[PDB]
Structures are given as structure tokens and as C-alpha cells.
Amino acid sequence: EADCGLRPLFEKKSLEDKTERELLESYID
Amino acid sequence: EADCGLRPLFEKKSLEDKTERELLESYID
Amino acid sequence: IVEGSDAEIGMSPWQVMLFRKSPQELLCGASLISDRWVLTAAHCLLYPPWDKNFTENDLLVRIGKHSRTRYERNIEKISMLEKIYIHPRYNWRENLDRDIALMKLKKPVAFSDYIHPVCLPDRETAASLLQAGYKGRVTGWGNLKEGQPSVLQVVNLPIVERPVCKDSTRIRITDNMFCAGYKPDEGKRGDACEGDSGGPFVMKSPFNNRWYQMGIVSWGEGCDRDGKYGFYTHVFRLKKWIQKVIDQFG
Amino acid sequence: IVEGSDAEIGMSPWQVMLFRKSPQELLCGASLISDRWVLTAAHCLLYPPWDKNFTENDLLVRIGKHSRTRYERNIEKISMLEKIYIHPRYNWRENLDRDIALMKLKKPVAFSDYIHPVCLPDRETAASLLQAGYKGRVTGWGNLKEGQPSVLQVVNLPIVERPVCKDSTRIRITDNMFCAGYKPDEGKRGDACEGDSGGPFVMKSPFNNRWYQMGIVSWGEGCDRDGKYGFYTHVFRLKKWIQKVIDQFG
Amino acid sequence: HPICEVSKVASHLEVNCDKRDLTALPPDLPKDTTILHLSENLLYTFSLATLMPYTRLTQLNLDRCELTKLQVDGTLPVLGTLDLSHNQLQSLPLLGQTLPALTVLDVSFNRLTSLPLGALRGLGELQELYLKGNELKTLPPGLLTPTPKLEKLSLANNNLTELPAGLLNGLENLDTLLLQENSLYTIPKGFFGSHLLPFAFLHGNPWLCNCEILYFRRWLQDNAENVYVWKQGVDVKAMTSNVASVQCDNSDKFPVYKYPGKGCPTLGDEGDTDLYDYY
Amino acid sequence: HPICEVSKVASHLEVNCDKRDLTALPPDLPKDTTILHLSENLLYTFSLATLMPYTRLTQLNLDRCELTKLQVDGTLPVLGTLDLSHNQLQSLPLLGQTLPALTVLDVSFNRLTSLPLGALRGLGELQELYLKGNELKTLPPGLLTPTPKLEKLSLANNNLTELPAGLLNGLENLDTLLLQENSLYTIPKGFFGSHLLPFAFLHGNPWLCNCEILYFRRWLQDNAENVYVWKQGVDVKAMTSNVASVQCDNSDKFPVYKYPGKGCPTLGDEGDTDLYDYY
Ligand SMILES: *[C@@H]1O[C@H](CO)[C@@H](O)[C@H](O)[C@H]1NC(C)=O
Ligand SMILES: *[C@@H]1O[C@H](CO)[C@@H](O)[C@H](O)[C@H]1NC(C)=O
Ligand SMILES: *P(=O)(OC(C)C)OC(C)C
Ligand SMILES: *P(=O)(OC(C)C)OC(C)C
DSSP, X not given: XXXXXXXXXXXXXXXXXXXXXXXXXXXXX | OTTTTOOTXXXXXTOOXXXXXXXXXXXXX | OBTOEEOOTTSOXXXXXXEETTTTEEEEEEEEOSSSEEEEOGGGTEEGGGTEEOOGGGEEEEESOOBSSSOOTTTXXXXXXEEEEEOTTOBTTTTOXXXXXXXXXXXXXXXXXSOOOOBOOOHHHHHXXXXXXXXXXXXXXXXXXXXXXXXXXXXXXXXXXXXXXXXXXXXXXXXXXXXEOOOGGGOOOOBOOTTXXXXXXXXXXXXXXXXXXXXXXXXXXXXXXXXXOEEEEETGGGHHHHHHHHHHHO | OBTOEEOOTTSOTTEEEEEETTTTEXXXXXXXXXXXXXXXXXXXXXXXXXXXXXXXXXXXXXXSOOBSSSOOTTXXXXXOEEEEEEOTTOBTTTTOBTOOXXXXXXXXXXXXXXXXXXXXXXXXXXXXXOOTTOEEEEEESOOSOOOOOSBOEEEEEEEEOHHHHHTTOSSOOOTTEEEEOOOGXXXXXXXXXXXXXXXXXXXXXXXXXXXXXXXXXXXXXXXXXXXXXXXXXXXXXXXXXXXXXXHHHO | OOSSEEEEETTEEEEEOOXXXXXXXXXXXXXXXXXXXXXXXXXXXXXXXXXXXXXXOOEEEOTTSOOSEEEOOSOOTTOOEEEOXXXXXXXXXXXXXXXXXXXXXXXXXXXXXXXXXXXXXXXXTOOEEEOTTSOOOOOOTTTTTTOTTOOEEEOOSSOOOOOOTTTTTTOTTXXXXXXXXSOOOOOOTTTTTTOOOSEEEOOSSXXXXXXXXXXHHHHHHHTGGGBBOOXXXXXXXXXXXXXXXXXBTTOTTSBGGGOOOTTOOOOSOSOOOOSSOOO | OOSSEEEEETTEEEEEOOSSOOSSOOSSOOTTOOEEEOOSOOOSEEEXXXXXXXXXXXXXXXXXXXXXXXXXXXXXTTOOEEEOOSSOOSSOOOOTTTOTTOOEEEOOSSXXXXXXXXXXXXXXXXXXXXXXXXXXXXXXXXXXXXXXXXXXXXXXXXXXXXXXXXXXXXXXXXXXXXXXXXOOOOOOTTTTTTOOOSEEEOOSSOBOOSGGGHHHHXXXXXXXXXXXXXXXXXXXXXXXXXXXXXXXXXXXXXXXXXXXXXXXXXXXXXXXXXXXXXX
């Protein structure tokens, strides 16, 4: 649980998602 | 393709081959 | 997943597949929340109306999968179940309230690039992120309409306000559940469907970059119908129960 | 065909003759598998080592023939080629692996007592019949030794076990090919030879009385030499490719 | 009926002619018979054609009938279950052209010594095949190719020394495989392919642990939780998993999955040979 | 020191740089400074990082400094008090990752119009929060979840029209709540929960007395002695209690706690919705 929700193929290598960007943009709308 | 491998001058008239008999006999040996 | 797309490799390393051993078939989705515990929907295991009651020996969990049907060797991991814990107050008789269940694995699983646990919401994340308008993510190998994807699907859906959820169905909505999906007027589609049940509804935290599981795919009238929304089990509100069975049986 | 005999009239109505237009000559054998598609060996059309590369306009196919040299009028049928499809992974550089090619005819052919399509093996027929000891049939107008028959020849040869095939040559045998022929100790001879290449290796099914093409005459060191066996293109294993080009280009 | 007991269980009409010292099929049975029990009788021979008058027949039990010859003519268009277990059959009846809808076939505890080429031809709907308790030493190649939908296969308690490399090809739905207590010396490379097999029984065999057993060792380690031990009187799923049961020389002190294989060359892999060709 | 007056009050070293027409942090201040006063200066902008050299800094006053921008980098490991009141800040500084030990935060009389999501994240030790005199119209959900130990909260004299139903969740120690003189129309059901609140200021609001105000009416009757009226220059505890101050339409002739609510359906209760689930 100490390393929860941190994807090894994404977060862990500064790489983004095809669509994660869409989730963050809703935090402002 | 529906009538494949059925020779008109042989199978189609209950006639056998000079040597086909040899092929079938190998299915037992 | 209706109107979704092909998940990328490893973008949902917590996704789990609840698989029936004999005959071989996909029952439901689920999620990895620890190296020995899996979370899923109660109606996926127990449902008297349909004479449904799967026990430990009828199932196996498949972690780290991408393909829906292949035996992804050296990538996916198969685990057996040691014990199934269904919420004591699971209401299958009226509205699938507290539609949640915990599954402990016979042996811990090793994490990899395809296998990694999701986060459970905390007071801060829950109060801060579970608000209408904000959107999460639903994944699964369920049907593409109300036919089957060859690979894991993904769709992002916005959370909907209690009222709109309430007046979208004749069933008694509870606080132990929220609804998500676009409105007829928003001009966008997407929803879970037969086979995604039990899967997770996650959200990426803008504060610490971590993914949290806010809900469990529970139910819905049809799949992606206008004026209709999908309902998910409110994981945070049931966290007090989750923690209880894990401290006492883990 | 070495050690064969005169084929009877119509006993191999699927036999095809790949004929060069100018100068007139027999290039290879081939087979009829449909009213518009002919199957043959890749090295019969393309082979860089010998600067060999025949295109549609260099050839014509002759179906329903018996005599090797006469223009059997009202019996044989001449067809032109619309398109030649050689296996993309045909290995002429190392061991003639995937030595196969498809030829689509400009116009369908009418079947008769001398023109009739052969069957392609199916899962059941292939697994059931392609076993060592069982024997098939090879036909063609190739040389009688390593000179030429005036009429179509025929010889029955037993399939040989992978090991014996493997240790009979220094070339890298593949699964996309099998070998046939008698052993030095079996006291019987027979093999294909210059000119039979591309021809079919057929087997008559004991289950439904139909003839199936298990292989295509591909290669061999010399003709009918003791301790040596002829190699044929495994048609079944390449059936997935055959079906692909026929559904998309037929 | 005068000789057999006729009952109505749900929509089924179950005719029971068990233990009635019958030597032949009783005349004039309910025209609407769907389930027929002829178990425990003295019908040294039986002819399926005699059942054609019963066009709704869905299940037939001919077990424990001293059968030594089963005549197969005509056709039973909807027979889905056939039990020929516990008889004296020396050769496998060819049922393909007479029972097109067969989904469950039991010929356990008979006297089979081999299976014919094309043995299961035409049994396209078969889902379960039990051949336990016979005297099979080998199996012909292509045995299961005509039964793509097989989910359960039992070859347990025979005298098998080897299995064909492609025995399981096409069985995308197989979930239970019983090979326990035979005379199996080894498993051919790629035998299991890339198919998920929830239940496998392989104990009770004289496994010869040498470099040829390495593929099997790899498989056992990777699928340890799918290996079980047979126990009469309890569901397969309830049985206990134990990869340690698959032992070398049948000695519980040397489980195959722990076989070192000292000196053995490189296992690495060349590629599980498939059915067709991909580049 | 050359510019500021350095004093020693008990174990504290109080450096006073008040009213010295400073436009920046004076160089070379006592290394052992624990209390720093920079009030009444012209520091249109300030960067907390510039105080890192003073590792014992426990209290910082930056009030009345024409502040319009507060840079937040680095960390002040033991700063417990921060006064940013009476400035020109238009957005709330995110202090969580720079001031881990903050227990008292004052940003009253500035120009805030809204508070950001996660605004108080990381301020786990916060006990007092003053936001009086700003222009807040609404508050984000989850504002106080990261400050569980809050004892005093002042949102008085803003322009609030509504409050989030769960604003107070987790505040088991809250003893003083100031919401007077806003534009509050109503209180959401269950707003106060089952928490004892000794001091509450709710006068000066346009309370809309209709059936939605009934929960608030019940609360006012049950906690009449906990409702006070603000009076400058005297301790909260000395102020006078008066539930009658919470009036409908801001008219002292119609106190909310006396609002009849004629025609209104059943109030009874369905249950104060909790945070988690109990059966
Ligand atoms: C489900 O089945 C198990 C045994 O398989 C039994 O003990 C349990 O009580 C059953 N539950 C229901 C709701 O039928
Ligand atoms: C064969 O000749 C044709 C034209 O006649 C040419 O387009 C093709 O690329 C040639 N292939 C080889 C292998 O030389
Ligand atoms: P899920 O597969 O379906 C959801 C779309 C509600 O649930 C099954 C097990 C009934
Ligand atoms: P085929 O005529 O010969 C076989 C006997 C290999 O091949 C020619 C075209 C080289």
C-alpha cells in the first residue's frame, strides 16, 4: 500500500496517458 | 469447392484406381 | 465498456479478472488493492434471484491481463481464493445496496509492470474529488453494447449529481452509491455493460499523482441509454468495513 | 516422376501444367483448387539465384491434360493468369521454406471429366492422415531419371518421419515441409524429378472418399537416390495464408 | 407400462427399466420417452436402430449390461447423453453418423485396447468424454480434432505410456484433464500449449525424470495450483491441489517440479510449435 | 541590529522591524530569531524562502504590508504562526508543503474571492483559521478535511450565500465558529452533526425562513445558549448569548428559532447523514 496507484509504465517514468489529461481538466470545469 | 476431390471418371461412378487401393491399405499398416 | 477504447499496456495494472474455472468463462471484473486482497461486487458472487452463489472453489483471479481470451503467459498471474467476504448487509433483495465483497488470495502476488495495486480513497481525497462534474475512469472486458472486446477497454465518465441520478430510476438510490455518465444534452456517450460489473471506477489525484478507486461497477438499467446513468458502489463510505475484515483476517 | 507409371485418363483431374509461352516449354506442375485459383511452388516462378522471375505475361496454365506435348483440343483448357501471389516469406536464400504460390485465372474454367478441383486439407484430415507410414500420390510430366514421359506419370510414396528426413540432408528442414519416399531397406523406388516441382501430393480420405492435397513438390537432392527423400511444401500449415489471399483477392 | 416404471420429472418422461433381467428392449414403451434407463440387464448386444421409434429420446443408459457388441445403424437425432460404462466392449463404437447431437459420452470400464483412426468423427457437439478404466496403451493422432468443444476428458486408469504431441489441439474450452494412474513416462514438448487448464490429474505415473521431462517441469511450476489428486466421492473443485503428487518414478520423495536436471543442456525454448504458420 | 529592534522576552528573541519603510527583508538579522515582526511596511511581494536562514523562527507577522504576492518555496520547519491579514492578496497561498507546523493562520481583510481545491492540504497541525473580511461567495467541498484539529474558524464578514453540507466533518475539537454578517440564506440539513459547539455567531444574515430552514430552527432551539453576538474589544467568552440575533430577513421581529413554518411537511428526521456507513 505504500506505493499504491503509481503505475510502473506511466507515472513511474514521467509518461502520460492517452486520456488521463481529460480527467485533470475536469478539476477546473 | 463443394464437390472437391471427387473424380468424375472414378469416384462418381463407383470405379477404382489402378493403384488407389495401395493408399488405403497403408491406413492399417 | 460501451463507447470506450483499447486500454494501453499497463495503464490499469490493478485490473483483475474474476474467472470461472468450469466451464471456463469471464464472470466479472475486480481490482487489486494489496498483494493479497482483491475487491469486487457482491452480486458477482451472490445473487439468490438468479440462483447465483459462487464459492472459493468455483473461481480463480487473473491479474495483469490485457487480452480478454488468451493465456498471457509470463505476464498475467493466476491466483486462487482463500476466502470470500461478502458485506453482511448486501441488499440484493431491493437495490443492490452495499454491493461489495473482498477476496483474500491463497498466496501473495508479485508486482510487475502489469501488476500493481490501486489506492483506496482517504477522507481528503474522497471529500475533495467525489463531486459532480469531475470525471473518473471505468475499465473492463464487458460487452460493447447491450459484442465483446478482444482487449481491455477504457472510458472516462463524469460524476452526476444526486438529484439527476435519483430521478433517472425508480429504484431506491442510497448514499452507499453514486452515478456517473453524460447527460443526453452533453453530446457524448459511454458506460459500463454486462461483464464490467465488479470493476473499478478510479480517479487520478491532482495533488499526489496517485490513482484512487472511488467506486465499483454495480448496476444500471440497460447500457448507455439516454437519460440513464451507471451506478457504482461508494467505496469510501464502505472503507470502515473493508479495513475491518483486512485487519482481522489478513 | 521416377519409377512411376502411366496415369489413367482422368485419375488426376486437378493436375495443372505451368507452361511458358515463348519459347514454348513446360516449366512446372501445379493444381486446380477452385474454378479460378491454381496452386504451385514459389521457386517455379521466383528464384533469384538463377535469375528466375516469371510474371503473368510469360505464362499460361493448361488444365485437363494427359499427353505431355500434344495440343489436346476439346479436352485440355488453356487459361491466362490475372495475378500471381507468392508467399511473402518464401525463403529461396536458405532452404525453400514456404515454397508456395497462388495463381488467379483471368476467367473461371468449366469443369468436365478431365477438369475437376482437388480438396484442401482440413484440421481433421491433416492431423489424421499426415503420419509416417501412410502414403500419398505424386503426379507430373517431369523427368524419368536424374528421359521424358510422353504422358502424365504417377507414383505412390510413403510419408517419412521427421528424424529420418532431418538426417538425410544438411539443409535446415522446417515444419512447413515434410518428406516422402521409401527407405534403402524397403526395396521399392519412386520420387519426383526435374519438372514435377509445383505438382501436388494428394491423399485419398478413408472417411469420405475425397482426395486432398497435403503437399506441393518442392525440392530434393538428386532423384530417387538411396538414403534420400523428396521434400514437399506442407499445404495445411500454409492454409491460413491461402485462405487469406483468396478471400481478399478472389 | 407393464415392465418398466414410467415417471414424469419436470418436462421429462423418465422410463426406468433397470434390473429386470431383460435380454432385449421392452416392446411398446412410452412414445414420448426422453430418458431411458436399461442399466443392470443382460443385453449382450444392442442395436441403436431399435430406439428410432422414440424421436424425443434425449438420454440413454446402457451401463452394466454385459455389452460386447453395440450395433450402430440409423440415427437418434437428439440423443445428447450415452452411458456405455461398465461393459465388455473390446472396440470403440463409431457413433458419429448415428448420434449427431451427442454431448456426453461414457465408455469407462470396458475392454478397449486401442482407438481407431477417425474414432470420434462427426461428434462435433461432444463436451465430455470418459474412457477411464480401459486398457489403452497409445492414442491415435487426430483423436480429438473432431471434438473442438471438449471441456472434460478422462483417460485415467488405462495403460498409457506416451501421449501424442498434438492430442489437445483446438480444445480452447478444455477445463478438466484426467491422466492419473497410467504408465506415463513423459510429456511431449508443447503438450499443453498456451491454453489455461484449471484441473489436471497427473499423479500415479512412472515419470522418467531426465532431460526430456524439463518442459513438463516448467509447466508444473507455472501451473502448480491447477494440479490435483483424485479422491472418490467429492467434486473435482473440492479436491485438493498438490503439484507434489506428480513424482519421479512414482516416489513421493522426488516431485517432478523439483527435479534438478543436472547436466541437462539448454532448456530456454525454441518455440511451442503451433498448428499453422505465422512468420 | 542596525535597522530592527532586538528584544529578549523570556526564552524568545523578538525582532521588531515594524514601520521602517522597508521594501525588503533586512539583511543579517539575529541568527536566533524566534519572533519576527515586519508589519506596516511596503513589501508588495515576499518570499518565505528568504527566512530559511533563521531555523528557530516560530512566529511571523506580515500584516499591513501591501502584499499582493506571497512566494512559497522551501520550508520553515517550525513556523507555528503566520499573520497575513490586512493585505492585498487575491488568491490563497498554498502553504501546506512549506509550513508543516503551522497552527494559526490569519488571512483576514484581503481580497480573496474563492478558495482552491486542496487549499489547506498539508496543514495538519492547524488549530486556528481566520478568513474574515474577504469576498468569498462559496467554499469548496473538502476545505477543512486536512485540518482535523481546527478549534477556531472565522469566515465572518464575507459574501457567503451557502455553505457545503460537510464543511465541518472531522472537526471533533471545533469550539468557535464565526459566520456573522455574510449573505447566508440557509443552513444545509445536518450541517452541525452531533458535535457540541460552545460558540456560534450567525447574526447579520438574510436567513430565508421557509421549510428548508427547519433543521436550522431545531438546532437553534436545542443550542440557544451557544449562540452569540459579536462585539469588538471583548473576549468571545465575555460576549452575550442571544439566539434571537439569528433573524429571518435580518429583521429582529422574526427570530429564526420562533419561525412557525406553517404548512411545511414533516420534519421528524430521516437521519443525519454520516461520513461512513453503519447499519
Ligand atoms: C452457498 O453455497 C454454500 C455451499 O456451497 C452454502 O454453505 C451457503 O450457505 C450458500 N449460500 C446461499 C445464499 O445459498
Ligand atoms: C520481377 O520482374 C518484375 C517486372 O518484370 C519486377 O517488378 C519485380 O520487382 C521483379 N522481382 C525480382 C525479385 O527481381
Ligand atoms: P455485471 O456483469 O453487469 C453490470 C453492467 C451491471 O453483473 C452481472 C454479474 C449480472
Ligand atoms: P522442379 O522442376 O524440380 C523438382 C524435382 C525440385 O524445379 C525447377 C523449376 C528447378
